[PDB]
Design a protein around this ligand. Structure first.
Ligand SMILES: *[C@H](O)[C@H](C[C@@H]1CCNC1=O)NC(=O)[C@H](CC(C)C)NC(=O)OCc1ccccc1
Ligand SMILES: *[C@H](O)[C@H](C[C@@H]1CCNC1=O)NC(=O)[C@H](CC(C)C)NC(=O)OCc1ccccc1
Lengths: 301, 301
């Protein structure tokens, strides 16, 4: 028993983290097969980063400007190319630790594990959820760029995120492994604002089901409400509207606890209207929305 | 920027997780050099686990009763012995993934990373703090025993915990890697109650310093209080008394923020008396006490 924010084992990803150097800028890189993936702003100076012509800085570079280190072993860059916002540095050595992998792009509301890295050395691992405004609330300092987010389905690692920047609100933004940014952000140091965020409603309900599975039942009631009536209270509290699929995704959790999906929304509407009255749910005084229904089933199996 | 509950990279520990089978009971084991460490109640049936004579069940066992699997490779047990509550199964093969390690016993209030395992396969990693009553609030299902807790100082892994049981309150208990239990618990399925817990005061202050470092300053005030006057309000709210060392440990965090240690206790005493008034600190509506001053410095470096 027990429910904890739990990241995937990071061993398979640890073996692919390298250090990428260009000029006086150093960040992390992802070593898959014979290509090193890293943010393209490694080729920029502090001069360039306000409004760089990434295409212009790249032509004036060549292979020996990129110092790639896999631990203490120096990797020889035998080629370079740019895919959107990601630099692809082909190296002579095929990474022997390369796991079965996929390049996936996740949806807002889904979760993934972030392996924090600095100078090509993993520092820590934690879970993050892609916010509806395509940001994440992580822990990134200077030199953290190149650290990747990932999920594991079986023995395959589904890479889904690479860190690039931090927004003025203390939130973080990045791209998928093909260099395409999550959200309306650009890899330049200008005034960039994230859109208005909202609470992932289906995640709160799945988290409430995890509480019932673990013995937390004080918020439960006997009354119900309709899906079109619950969307009325959700629009008031900056919550996402609930769809029939979202109910179907919450199917197994509703069956394991014997609590209909719409029954839990009635408790959620009470929790939003009446507050929580200074009590806790799974050790939280707030409604948590960073646990997908899959995350609950994986822990409460 | 950003502060997140962050576990250590689990790759070095992943390479030592095995599966240990005895009869119809299967749990996890720690493969270090040529010894497999696992909880001794693997030799017990559901019959035996109420009040077992672990010394009696062990003599009636021998090597071929222990099926050890390192992935798909079967390990040959060439010997067995008991160290308190831990079974030491010597195997013929030296684990080639054995990292530099230490067998450490941690103090209540300190943190460590738990690598959740099932059938010798790592499932997830998360941080836990040893509660003052020698329990941890983790995520353990059936078959999770043998999973270890650990810290990493440099390239050395300081193993500090091995899971054994779950208490009636949903909390978990285990031993150090020498088989000595944390707290007044025994590896038998009887009525066992954890002692009354208290809030780690020095951890709350260090967590409040992490909030100031990350831009959260609404709880700050200009007034102060003495260490012997703050211990008066702490004893009221089931908080631990604060010592001069604890202030000295909070030294660097007090210097980085320019906020004296006793100044933060005044805000904490206000937060305990006046509540938080429906606002948040680092995304939390509760005062968090599972971050050591070291954990803050490591993330807010
Ligand atoms: C890459 O390692 C770095 C990660 C940042 C550092 C602070 N927090 C992070 O997540 N990214 C940048 O420095 C980035 C580079 C641009 C070319 C995209 N710029 C950036 O994040 O600017 C805003 C900022 C900088 C420093 C501290 C806080 C915010
Ligand atoms: C070992 O894998 C297992 C871990 C338990 C399973 C439930 N949560 C855990 O952390 N330990 C036991 O089953 C343990 C064995 C004794 C010989 C120490 N007994 C135990 O935890 O009993 C209480 C309990 C059992 C099942 C569910 C909840 C509590």
């Amino acid at each position: 028993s027990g429910f904890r924010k739990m990241a995937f084992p990071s061993g398979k990803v640890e073996g692919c983290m390298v250090q990428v150097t260009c000029g006086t800028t150093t960040l992390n890189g992802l070593w898959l097969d014979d290509v090193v993936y890293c943010p393209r702003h490694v080729i920029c100076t502090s001069e360039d980063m306000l409004n760089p012509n990434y295409e212009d800085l790249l032509i004036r570079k060549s292979n020996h400007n990129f110092l790639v280190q896999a631990g203490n072993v120096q990797l020889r860059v035998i080629g370079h190319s740019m895919q959107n916002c990601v630099l692809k540095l082909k190296v002579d050595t095929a990474n022997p630790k390369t796991p079965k992998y996929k390049f996936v792009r996740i949806q807002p509301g889904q979760t993934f594990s972030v392996l924090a890295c600095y100078n090509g050395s993993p520092s820590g691992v934690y879970q993050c959820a892609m916010r509806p405004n395509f940001t994440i609330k992580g822990s990134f300092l200077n030199g953290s760029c190149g650290s990747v987010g990932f999920n594991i389905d079986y023995d395959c690692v589904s890479f889904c995120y690479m860190h690039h920047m931090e927004l003025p609100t203390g939130v973080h933004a990045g791209t998928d492994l093909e260099g395409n940014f999550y959200g309306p952000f650009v890899d330049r140091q200008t005034a960039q604002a994230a859109g208005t965020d909202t609470t992932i409603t289906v995640n709160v309900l799945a988290w409430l089901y995890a509480a019932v599975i673990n013995g937390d039942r004080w918020f439960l009631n006997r009354f119900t409400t309709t899906l079109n009536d619950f969307n009325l209270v959700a629009m008031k509290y900056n919550y996402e509207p609930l769809t029939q699929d979202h109910v179907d995704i919450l199917g197994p959790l509703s069956a394991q606890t014997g609590i209909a999906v719409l029954d839990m929304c009635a408790s959620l509407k009470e929790l939003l209207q009446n507050g929580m009255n200074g009590r806790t749910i799974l050790g939280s005084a707030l409604l948590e929305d960073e646990f997908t229904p899959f995350d609950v089933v994986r822990q409460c199996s």
